[PDB]
């Protein structure tokens, strides 16, 4: 970070695979970079490096990840377009320009081997070269830093894509083109100001959709139609305006990750225990009063986040869960700790989060056993 140039001793290793050069002016890529052949990741932050023919030939076959964070258009080296075996790319910097839009990325076409492309470049609209390179992509990440992103039938043409992330694209409403991507398996739309997500009724067109991410939005209510997505295992809808949970949502018995923290929840439906594969529960910062009995049906509940909740008493069924690996209780108005929590074989002191002045309320035998299990 912030050196005069490339030291010549850094070529002393063969165990290197990630190189990160940031704010290091006028670094010329020597042929001596051949001293490390297994290197596959390279970070060039705020530095357009000058390259040599042996170095370019070496990089044309033995590089996989290139990170380009640029304060200027000229800070992007041109020669990076010549590489053929690249598979991970990252372009950070506001390349959006008037009447020369997405022209700095014209050499992206030759990256046939590419599978991963991440974009944090304040792109107001979807670039055409992105559509060109989406014929064979496996992961596309777009981050506009809250800028409104417009597609208008330009994202459905990436049939081979397997992961889609449109973070802070300010869509405010799901575009239909995403439903055309039948190969798409996991979708992330974090912080896009979503208020009505009934478009999930089209999600049945995705037969391998097992994870959905629509968190950090203004979603008021969860449509019951999400019960049609039985495949889902991880569902993320926390940081929203949800006060009630539809019962039909609990038709997806495959659900394993259910995080709904920072919401207006007050009751946990009796159907929450219908999901045997439920492994992670997170309702932190809510108004939950008590744990429903069915919530203990999931014996493999390996995570439990109950913090900042108004629970009055801890149910005694918690000891019936033996796969409990971690649970946080800090921030709750509990009179005393039930001893059943102490009978979990997988539980540890570090796994448990609770106030010491109440943690001492447990009998000394249970506390000593917990400390011993924490030690080794």
């Amino acid at each position, epitope marked *: 970070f912030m050196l005069s140039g490339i030291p010549d001793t850094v070529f002393d290793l063969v165990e290197l695979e990630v190189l990160k050069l940031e704010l290091i002016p006028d670094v010329t890529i020597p042929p001596s970079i051949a001293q490390l052949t297994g290197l596959k990741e390279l970070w060039l932050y705020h530095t357009a490096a000058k390259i040599e023919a042996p170095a370019l030939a070496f990089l044309r076959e033995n590089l996989r990840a290139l990170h380009i964070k640029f304060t200027d258009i000229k800070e992007i080296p041109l020669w990076i377009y010549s590489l053929k075996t690249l598979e991970e790319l990252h372009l950070t910097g506001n390349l959006s320009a008037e009447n020369n839009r997405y022209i700095v990325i014209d050499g992206l076409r030759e990256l046939k081997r590419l599978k991963v492309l991440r974009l944090k470049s304040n792109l107001s609209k979807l670039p055409q070269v992105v559509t060109d390179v989406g014929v064979h992509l496996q992961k596309l990440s777009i981050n506009n830093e809250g800028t409104k992103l417009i597609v208008l039938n330009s994202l459905k043409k990436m049939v081979n894509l397997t992961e889609l992330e449109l973070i802070r694209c300010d869509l405010e409403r799901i575009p239909h083109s995403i439903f055309s991507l039948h190969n798409l398996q996991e979708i992330d739309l974090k912080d896009n100001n979503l208020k*009505t997500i*009934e478009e999930i*009724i*089209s999600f049945q*067109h995705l037969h391998r959709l097992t994870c959905l991410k629509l968190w950090y939005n203004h979603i008021a209510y969860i*449509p*019951i*139609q999400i019960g*049609n997505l039985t495949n889902l295992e991880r569902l993320y809808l926390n940081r929203n305006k949800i006060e009630k949970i539809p019962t039909q949502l609990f038709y997806c018995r495959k659900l394993r990750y259910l995080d709904l923290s920072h919401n207006n929840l007050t009751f946990l439906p009796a159907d929450i225990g219908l999901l045997q594969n439920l492994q992670n529960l997170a309702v932190t910062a809510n108004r939950i009063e008590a744990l429903p009995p069915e919530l203990f049906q999931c014996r493999k509940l390996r995570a439990l986040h109950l913090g900042n909740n108004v629970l009055q008493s801890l149910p005694s069924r918690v000891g019936e869960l033996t796969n409990l690996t971690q649970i946080e209780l800090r921030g709750n108005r509990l009179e005393c700790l039930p001893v059943e929590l102490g009978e979990c074989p997988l539980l540890k002191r570090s796994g448990l989060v609770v106030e010491e002045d109440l943690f001492s309320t447990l009998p000394p035998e249970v506390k000593e056993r917990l400390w011993r299990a924490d030690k080794e």
Partner: nanobody
Amino acid sequence: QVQLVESGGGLVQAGGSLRLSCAASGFPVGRHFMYWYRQAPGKEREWVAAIYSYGEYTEYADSVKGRFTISRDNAKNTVYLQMNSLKPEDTAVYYCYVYVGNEYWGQGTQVTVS
């Protein structure tokens, strides 16, 4: 005041067509997503079709996709569901469903296939 009423149910032969009309009063049908579900005896209620609020995008149950047709007329604030190529496997009572602040299930119409 949000009221969903179903009309057009009854008995119909296999391979025929039937019109199920869902009428709404309290809310406009132009800006609201509408849903049609069905329930058969010995089986929990099953979703059939859904219609959007923008773009006239319509989805249907894969078992009956292409067999039924859902449309809406905003002037009468109604949803028309035309069922074609009927078979005994879809003998069920069909309900109109919406969520406007709260859930709303319609009266429903039982269609039997002979």
